[PDB]
Design an enzyme around this catalytic site. Structure first.
Site, PDB file in Angstrom:
ATOM      1  N   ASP B 396       5.693 -12.493  16.248  1.00  0.00           N
ATOM      2  CA  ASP B 396       5.292 -11.750  15.065  1.00  0.00           C
ATOM      3  C   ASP B 396       6.541 -11.239  14.362  1.00  0.00           C
ATOM      4  OD1 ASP B 396       3.181 -10.363  13.387  1.00  0.00           O
ATOM      5  OD2 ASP B 396       4.276  -8.606  14.114  1.00  0.00           O
ATOM      6  N   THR B 398       7.330  -8.831  11.866  1.00  0.00           N
ATOM      7  CA  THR B 398       7.652  -7.415  11.776  1.00  0.00           C
ATOM      8  C   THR B 398       7.725  -6.795  13.165  1.00  0.00           C
ATOM      9  OG1 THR B 398       6.524  -7.313   9.642  1.00  0.00           O
ATOM     10  CG2 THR B 398       7.004  -5.233  10.745  1.00  0.00           C
ATOM     11  N   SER B 516      -8.553  -1.933   7.711  1.00  0.00           N
ATOM     12  CA  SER B 516      -9.949  -2.135   7.315  1.00  0.00           C
ATOM     13  C   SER B 516     -10.059  -2.876   5.986  1.00  0.00           C
ATOM     14  CB  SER B 516     -10.708  -0.807   7.250  1.00  0.00           C
ATOM     15  OG  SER B 516     -12.053  -1.008   6.853  1.00  0.00           O
ATOM     16  N   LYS B 539      -0.661   3.510  -4.625  1.00  0.00           N
ATOM     17  CA  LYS B 539       0.209   2.421  -4.208  1.00  0.00           C
ATOM     18  C   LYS B 539      -0.504   1.613  -3.138  1.00  0.00           C
ATOM     19  CE  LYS B 539       3.385   3.262  -1.333  1.00  0.00           C
ATOM     20  NZ  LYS B 539       2.502   2.872  -0.201  1.00  0.00           N
ATOM     21  N   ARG B 575       9.356  -7.767   0.287  1.00  0.00           N
ATOM     22  CA  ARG B 575       7.975  -7.352   0.496  1.00  0.00           C
ATOM     23  C   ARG B 575       7.488  -6.607  -0.740  1.00  0.00           C
ATOM     24  NH1 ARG B 575       7.005  -3.757   3.499  1.00  0.00           N
ATOM     25  NH2 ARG B 575       5.049  -4.388   4.507  1.00  0.00           N
ATOM     26  N   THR B 576       6.414  -7.103  -1.342  1.00  0.00           N
ATOM     27  CA  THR B 576       5.906  -6.557  -2.590  1.00  0.00           C
ATOM     28  C   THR B 576       5.017  -5.350  -2.337  1.00  0.00           C
ATOM     29  OG1 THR B 576       3.990  -8.034  -2.582  1.00  0.00           O
ATOM     30  CG2 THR B 576       6.006  -8.833  -3.628  1.00  0.00           C
ATOM     31  N   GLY B 656       3.214 -11.056   8.892  1.00  0.00           N
ATOM     32  CA  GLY B 656       2.244 -10.301   8.125  1.00  0.00           C
ATOM     33  C   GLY B 656       2.576 -10.208   6.651  1.00  0.00           C
ATOM     34  N   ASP B 657       3.498 -11.043   6.187  1.00  0.00           N
ATOM     35  CA  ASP B 657       3.899 -11.065   4.789  1.00  0.00           C
ATOM     36  C   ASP B 657       3.209 -12.210   4.055  1.00  0.00           C
ATOM     37  OD1 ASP B 657       5.487  -9.066   5.729  1.00  0.00           O
ATOM     38  OD2 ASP B 657       7.394  -9.923   5.060  1.00  0.00           O
TER      39      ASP B 657
END
Ligand SMILES: *[C@@H]1O[C@H](CO)[C@@H](O[C@@H]2O[C@H](CO)[C@@H](O[C@@H]3O[C@H](CO[C@H]4O[C@H](CO)[C@@H](O[C@H]5O[C@H](CO)[C@@H](O)[C@H](O)[C@@H]5O)[C@H](O)[C@@H]4O)[C@@H](O)[C@H](O[C@H]4O[C@H](CO)[C@@H](O)[C@H](O)[C@@H]4O)[C@@H]3O)[C@H](O)[C@H]2NC(C)=O)[C@H](O)[C@H]1NC(C)=O
Ligand SMILES: *[C@@H]1O[C@H](CO)[C@@H](O[C@@H]2O[C@H](CO)[C@@H](O)[C@H](O)[C@H]2NC(C)=O)[C@H](O)[C@H]1NC(C)=O
Ligand SMILES: *[C@@H]1O[C@H](CO)[C@@H](O[C@@H]2O[C@H](CO)[C@@H](O)[C@H](O)[C@H]2NC(C)=O)[C@H](O)[C@H]1NC(C)=O
Ligand SMILES: *[C@@H]1O[C@H](CO)[C@@H](O)[C@H](O)[C@H]1NC(C)=O
Ligand SMILES: [Mg+2]
Lengths: 349, 1082
Positions: B396, B398, B516, B539, B575-576, B656-657
């Protein structure tokens, strides 16, 4: 690396060859005469005369330095006598006349050879009670529970020598080896064999002379010691320590065909001539296809006349020399370089 | 057991109904402290003995000893025969007891959490009980910042009303809140009022599974007890002071341990390959036994028909030739007892433990930073050899490939890029322009919309201590670029825009905070300006922010420019994270506020209620900008990944990006280098399976062999989340995905889910069957590590669950590279050689005995004295095996770290199979035959000495035993390439020990310890046969092995052997920069 494998083989061969030669030479400087007297009961003449023994009965293993050929030795003769007017144990005498081609050196030993006799069998090898033989006070229940499983006790009277080894003691004796044609008169001269020193002086320690915790009437002799002791132990406990034949027999042999020493001579030289040895045939071996024998052999530094290790060394040396020469030839033909980085997986195309 | 009745009168529920034994109530041991250990102190012996004797071999040894106990099979005193088994049992028991003590100490440290359960009747006192709460019949007013021991139906609270907050962190990640109790309420006062009063009859629904649903009831003298009324487990926020309620359901081990905590056990591949070899050895022993039984029965019948001297007195019930054949079977089992591995398992376990210790004490995989010094711990004292056989690695991004401490790089405000962020924002902020207003709003929403807590103890500095790294980075960057978040000491928070210290008002923190599928983190704020307007700050992820916008005015051009800017930011490996802006009219604001206030406590669902409230309040968001934070890759990650690639190890990454921003993070992680085609599957108006099959046809369909399964210098594969979900949904799609993943070496999966990662690892491990490794830090990582062959954890900042639930706990990825390569390679090599040599020595002993059994009527009689046979697996030859297991090397670690291509032998399993086992068995048979036959025919003679004494069994037996010990030890030494002192000691201490034993044991007088061999000190050391036979048999036995080893090194070398020769003969070679070596980078 060739530099570590060719010199190693060459050195190994250069070391092996002299050792093998020495062992072969030492084995060659040994004499051995083998005489088979098992079938002396049925084939030997039972009148008083003699008959030449069958060819497949006697074997001569002469020394290398002896000029006498094997085929130049006269065939031994034998005779059989069974007269029931002598003591028990000497009733069936087999007399074998054998000729010694050359003077056997000092230190001559006499052995009896048994074939197809499995002393190494599991039922036999462990079939003895060490603590009873050492003479310690061992109770009757412990004797029943000891390693003397098949022959332990009967009617509450335990056997002193128990088990199967003691029951099958070799009761065949050769109490004469006489020279029939000496030089200094005395038409027959007896080559004196001594029945002392047969066993090493360390086996007598693990056998007791007389037991103290049982009276010499509550112990029964083994089943096969009935002719020697017909009415039990009347003269006292047998002195197993002081007799060497029992100690020699109670040492399990490695192979079915084994030789056990029976009398030895050290300071006397066997002359050249025809002898006559009397064998008291009392131990049946024909039932299980066994053959007894009489072996008279001399001793060298290695021991008996068994030139197997020496010739094995010679064969190993020859093989090492062949391999070393082949490797040297290969090195001189195609000298593959050390640290060759062309046969690597990522280098090969 | 659905229903339970509680609270008759007073705590300590002595009597409810019936007597005992059926309801399991009132201290009936229905609950107890969690037992992560193995057994009890009293019951240690039975469980330990069962575990040890479930190894087949140990039960065989016990059966052999028990057979020896009976006089029919007895040879010597039972103590000598039982000593090796007792020693093995003791060592194994000590090992498992040490492991169990470690686990029990960990559990004890975890437990014993102070719990304040009060009420006992002097009349009041004591309380502050242990973590093991008293059954389900008491109540606790647990103070602030204290963990929950068990579930509870809390009635009242120290703070206003009975509202509480628990922050379920060990079960979830989001915040938590309660919705009061109800009718008990004020009537259910605390502090001895619950003791003085006596009402309520607690009712329960399902003790088995209650997650997100813990409904219940209670009747005093019916009330809807719900999940939002019932706290579950292990959750502590305590935004209030303390909460008081009655303990029900679980005492310690009924709710959360039921929810999760199923830890399996793992075994190495080498052990699973070793088991068939043990079975084969047992089969060989049984075959020898049956053949010996048959031949011995035939021979005994023959020798008892014609009365021999060794078959006399067989006319009994326990000595007839039939029961003699059965006894021969048993004694064949008792004679060749060395073939079944006795000390192999204990030796292997000790070697693996020492290898794990070496993994620990390694200084090249130890991380030092900020004082703390993390060490690579081997949490599993086994599996040290599966690291060398790794063929797949799943990671993974991150927390494992990144430092989890990201720093702001570029900020977009409207239409201009910016490249410790100072940039031109200082040069652009000049008032009286729409761009300046947008910049002010962007910085405000970046500096207020968070949950960060600020420390003002250092004026001017004002350090920020946030929870998630992204918020800390954004707030610190905003402070450094102007607007400084002054603090949130009171309900009113303040801002430090570079004109004054203007302050806003905090009303309703939409603390949703990701998870969630709801990644928005908005917050409603009001400025203290004389207008006092209500505006919303937000945000969140790009998708949610973009979908929550408006579609009029120039906002369309604003959105398209922002989308282009977002794509440009993602292309650079960033990362946006977008920002929004909403204005709330007072009337709708207050109406929605009262709706939210009355919906906060509902006693029904309230989850979808809160979500719908959040979705409804967000209707007129205005885009403000798009931040971009770069995740710092750990030092050495690119080189580590490149070296892993040059080992045949496939490196998957489940990041996770977004896909574009995680294409090897812009090709920077070396996962996706140049000159390697990448396959992208995104499911754009197409079927996932159809697209995957079409891509497979286009890129490899020309292969004829591939079409059978269907019935640029490399390749990769990209499948983000939905291709994975649909492949695991169907079957043919899963098969195609497995094929395309097998035919590539870098699969990058972006925006994945925990279950998806676990299913990836399960798919590879099950269908392919190859060894797998998983590494991570989060909870998803703990799942994928539990469901993997070898698990590795990283002690990151995201928590410590992964380290706890993993086989190894590294601190850096380069540590993974070094560990894998050097430690796994060496461990596999050592274990393989050790097992093979152990089998070899056992076979040597058994073979010498068998070759003697040829010449004894197959009566199963040991040629050696039983002392030599009893001390074979111990004393004589165990030290060389241990030395091979511990100190053996095939090449120095520098070469392994420099040229990872040597990993092929360990990865492909060329060190331990069945052909090598057969070769070692055959070598043992050959050497045993050579020894026995040569020494036997040497001793076929009259005296074998100068004194004329007869050659009996034990002279030849002892010569053969000494020769066999020498051959075995020198064979083990010849199979050693790391001769440094210790192996010398082992190889020349074994035979030294047997020589000393023969010298001394043969001088013990028959007065004590009969010993059966009195005189061998005179019959062997003085005999030329012994002194010329033992070296001869040693040389002849070792010669074929030496020649074969030399020819394999020279004629047909391996890569490892060739590199060893290169290092030995050419020390002045630069492996990193040589044209025919690592300089080629191949
Ligand atoms: C040199 O040594 C050899 C051998 O070392 C001596 O030869 C042995 O001499 C023994 C003593 O006389 C003999 O034992 C006796 O044998 C007779 C008859 O033999 C048969 O008897 C039975 C048939 O009727 C039967 O006996 C059992 O034999 C086995 C155990 O002996 C059992 O397994 C088997 O099942 C039988 O049940 C056999 O068929 C025999 O072949 C017996 O009657 C004698 O019994 C008497 O003595 C025993 C002593 O313990 C006593 O209990 C009895 O109650 C009874 O009174 C006795 O067993 C032996 O047969 C013989 N063996 C050979 C091969 O010749 C030799 O004498 C010796 N010579 C010198 C000079 O020393
Ligand atoms: C010497 O002669 C005696 C008596 O003539 C033999 O003893 C008999 O041997 C036979 C052999 O089949 C047995 O069946 C008899 O039971 C023995 N006893 C008697 C009284 O006859 C003895 O075997 C002979 N020695 C040999 C042949 O070596
Ligand atoms: C065996 O011993 C006997 C007697 O101990 C030896 O016989 C003697 O031999 C010498 C030499 O010929 C004579 O002078 C004696 O008179 C003999 N004595 C007797 C009693 O006969 C015999 O020589 C010895 N045999 C060997 C081979 O040494
Ligand atoms: C040895 O010779 C003597 C007399 O010369 C004779 O009495 C005796 O019987 C002989 N012994 C034999 C031939 O065994
Ligand atoms: Mg992570």
């Amino acid at each position: 690396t060739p530099k570590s494998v060719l010199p190693t083989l060459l050195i190994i061969g250069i070391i092996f060859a002299p050792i093998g030669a020495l062992i072969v030479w030492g084995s060659g400087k040994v004499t051995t005469i083998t005489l088979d007297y098992t079938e002396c009961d049925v084939d030997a003449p039972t009148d008083g005369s003699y008959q030449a023994m069958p060819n497949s009965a006697y074997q001569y293993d002469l020394a290398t330095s002896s000029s006498v050929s094997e085929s130049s030795i006269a065939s031994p003769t034998w005779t059989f006598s069974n007269d029931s007017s002598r003591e028990v144990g000497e009733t069936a005498r087999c007399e074998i006349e054998f000729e010694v081609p050359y003077d056997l050196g000092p230190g001559l030993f006499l052995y009896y050879k048994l074939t197809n006799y499995y002393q190494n069998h599991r039922r036999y090898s462990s079939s003895f009670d060490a603590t009873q033989l050492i003479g310690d006070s061992r109770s009757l229940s412990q004797i029943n529970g000891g390693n003397c499983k098949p022959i332990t006790s009967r009617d509450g009277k335990p056997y002193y020598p128990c088990g199967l080894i003691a029951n099958s003691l070799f009761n065949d004796t050769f109490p004469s080896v006489v020279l029939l044609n000496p030089t200094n008169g005395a038409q027959n001269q007896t080559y004196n064999f001594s029945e002392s020193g047969i066993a090493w002086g360390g086996i007598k320690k693990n056998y007791a002379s007389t037991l103290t915790y049982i009276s010499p009437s509550d112990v029964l002799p083994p089943p096969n010691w009935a002719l020697k002791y017909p009415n039990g132990y009347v003269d006292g406990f047998p002195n197993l320590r002081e007799d060497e034949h029992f100690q020699v027999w109670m040492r399990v042999a490695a192979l079915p065909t084994f030789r056990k020493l029976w009398a030895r001579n050290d300071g006397e030289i066997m002359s050249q001539g025809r002898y006559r040895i009397v064998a008291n045939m009392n131990y049946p071996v024909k039932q299980f296809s066994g053959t007894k024998s009489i072996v008279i052999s001399t001793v060298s530094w290695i021991g008996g006349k068994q030139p197997f290790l020496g010739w094995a060394y010679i064969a190993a040396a020859i093989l090492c020399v062949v391999l070393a020469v082949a490797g040297l030839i290969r090195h001189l033909v195609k000298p593959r370089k050390l640290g060759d980085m062309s046969l690597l997986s990522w280098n090969q195309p | 057991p659905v229903p339970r009745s509680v609270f008759i009168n007073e705590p300590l529920p002595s009597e409810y109904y019936d007597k005992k034994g059926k309801i399991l109530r009132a201290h009936h041991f229905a609950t107890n402290q969690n037992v992560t250990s193995k057994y009890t102190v009293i019951t240690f012996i039975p469980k330990n003995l069962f575990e040890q004797f479930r190894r087949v071999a140990n039960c065989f040894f016990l059966a052999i000893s028990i057979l020896q106990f009976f006089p029919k099979f007895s040879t010597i005193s039972p103590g000598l025969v039982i000593l090796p088994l007792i020693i093995v049992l003791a060592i194994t028991a000590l090992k498992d007891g040490y492991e169990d003590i470690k686990r029990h100490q960990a559990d004890h440290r975890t437990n014993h959490a102070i719990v304040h359960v009060l009420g006992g009747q002097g009349e009041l006192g004591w309380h502050r009980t242990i973590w093991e709460d008293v059954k389900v019949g008491d109540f606790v007013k647990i103070y602030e910042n204290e963990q929950f021991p068990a579930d509870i139906v809390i009635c009242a609270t120290s703070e206003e009303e009975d509202v509480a907050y628990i922050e379920t962190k060990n079960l979830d990640g989001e915040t938590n809140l309660k919705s009061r109790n109800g009718v008990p309420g004020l009537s259910h006062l605390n502090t001895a009022e619950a003791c003085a009063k006596a009402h309520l009859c607690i009712d329960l629904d399902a003790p088995e599974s209650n997650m997100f649903r813990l409904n219940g009831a209670v009747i005093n003298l019916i009330h809807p007890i719900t999940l939002e009324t019932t706290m579950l487990r292990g959750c502590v926020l305590k935004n209030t002071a303390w909460v008081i309620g009655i303990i029900v359901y679980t005492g310690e081990d009924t709710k959360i341990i039921r929810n999760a905590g199923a830890t399996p056990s793992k075994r190495s591949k080498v052990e699973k390959q070793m088991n068939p070899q043990v079975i084969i050895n047992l089969v060989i022993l049984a075959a020898i036994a049956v053949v010996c039984a048959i031949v011995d029965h035939v021979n005994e019948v023959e020798w008892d028909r014609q009365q021999a001297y060794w078959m006399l007195f067989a006319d009994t019930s326990g000595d007839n030739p039939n029961i003699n054949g059965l006894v021969t079977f048993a004694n064949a089992f008792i004679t060749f007892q060395n073939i079944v591995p006795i000390s192999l398992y204990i030796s292997i376990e000790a070697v693996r433990t020492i290898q794990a210790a070496f993994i620990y004490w390694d200084r090249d995989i130890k991380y030092k930073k900020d004082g703390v010094t993390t060490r690579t711990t081997a949490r599993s004292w086994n599996l040290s050899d599966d690291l060398g056989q790794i063929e797949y690695i799943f990671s993974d991004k991150t927390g494992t490939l990144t430092q989890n401490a990201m720093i702001f790089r570029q900020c977009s405000v409207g239409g201009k890029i910016y490249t410790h962020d100072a940039e031109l924002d200082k040069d652009l902020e000049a008032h009286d322009s729409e761009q300046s207003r947008i910049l002010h709003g962007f910085f405000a929403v970046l500096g207020l919309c968070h949950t960060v807590l600020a420390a003002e103890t250092e004026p001017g500095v004002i350090e920020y201590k946030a929870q998630s790294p992204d918020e800390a980075a954004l707030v610190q960057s905003a402070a450094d670029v102007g607007f400084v978040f002054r603090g949130r000491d009171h309900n009113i928070l303040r801002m430090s825009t570079p004109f004054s210290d203007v302050s806003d008002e905090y009303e309703l923190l939409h603390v949703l905070e990701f998870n969630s599928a709801r990644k928005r983190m908005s917050v409603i704020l009001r400025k203290l300006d004389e207008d006092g307007r209500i505006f919303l700050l937000c945000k969140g992820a790009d998708n949610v922010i973009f979908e929550r916008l408006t579609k009029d005015s120039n906002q369309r051009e604003m959105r398209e420019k922002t989308d282009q800017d977002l794509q440009y930011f993602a292309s650079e490996g960033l990362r946006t994270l977008c920002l929004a802006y909403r204005i709330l009219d007072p009337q709708v604001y207050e109406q929605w506020a009262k709706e939210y206030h009355n919906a906060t406590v509902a006693l029904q669902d309230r989850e979808e209620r809160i979500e719908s409230v959040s979705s409804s309040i967000e209707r007129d968001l205005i885009l403000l900008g798009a931040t971009a934070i770069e995740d710092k890759l750990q030092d050495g990650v690119p080189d580590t990944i490149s070296d892993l690639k040059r080992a045949g190890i496939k490196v998957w990454v489940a990041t996770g990006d977004k896909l574009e921003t995680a294409v090897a993070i812009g090709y920077t992680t070396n996962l996706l280098t140049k000159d390697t085609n990448l396959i992208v599957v995104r499911e754009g108006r197409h079927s996932i399976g159809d697209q995957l099959r079409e891509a497979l046809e286009e890129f490899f369909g020309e292969d004829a062999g591939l079409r059978t399964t269907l019935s640029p210098g490399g390749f990769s594969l990209v499948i983000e989340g939905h291709a994975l979900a649909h492949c695991f949904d169907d079957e043919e799609t899963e098969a195609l995905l497995l094929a395309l993943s097998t035919r590539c070496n870098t699969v990058i999966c972006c925006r994945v889910s925990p279950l998806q990662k676990a299913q990836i690892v399960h798919l590879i491990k099950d269908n392919l069957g190859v060894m797998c490794l998983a590494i991570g830090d989060g909870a998803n990582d703990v799942s994928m590590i539990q469901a993997a062959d070898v698990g590795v954890g990283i002690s990151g900042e995201e928590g410590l669950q992964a380290v706890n639930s993993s086989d190894y706990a590294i601190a850096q990825f380069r540590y993974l590279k070094r560990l894998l390569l050097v430690h796994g390679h060496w461990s596999y090599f050592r274990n393989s050689s050790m097992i093979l040599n152990f089998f070899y020595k056992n076979i040597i002993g058994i073979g010498v005995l068998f070759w003697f059994m040829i010449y004894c009527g197959w009566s199963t009689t040991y040629v050696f004295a039983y002392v030599y046979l009893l001390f074979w697996n111990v004393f004589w030859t165990l030290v060389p095996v241990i030395a091979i297991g511990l100190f053996d090397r095939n090449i120095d670690d520098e070469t392994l770290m420099a040229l990872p291509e040597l990993y092929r032998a360990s990865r492909e399993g060329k060190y331990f199979g069945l052909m090598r086992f057969a070769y070692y068995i055959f070598e043992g048979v050959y050497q045993s035959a050579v020894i026995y036959f040569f020494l036997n025919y040497t001793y076929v003679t009259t005296t074998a000495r100068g004194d004329g004494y007869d050659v009996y069994m034990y002279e030849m037996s002892t010569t053969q035993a000494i020769g066999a010990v020498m051959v075995a030890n020198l064979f083990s030494g010849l199979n050693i390439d790391a001769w440094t002192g210790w192996v010398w000691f082992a190889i020349w201490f074994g035979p030294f020990l047997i020589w000393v034993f023969t010298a001394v044991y043969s001088v013990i007088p028959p007065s004590s310890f009969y010993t059966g061999v009195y005189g061998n000190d005179v019959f062997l050391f003085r005999s030329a046969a012994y002194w010329f036979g033992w070296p001869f048999v040693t040389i002849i036995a070792l010669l074929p092995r030496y020649l074969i080893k030399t020819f394999r090194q020279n004629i047909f070398p391996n890569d490892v052997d060739t590199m060893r020769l290169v290092r030995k003969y050419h020390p002045e070679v630069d492996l990193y920069n040589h044209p025919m070596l690592g300089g080629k980078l191949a």
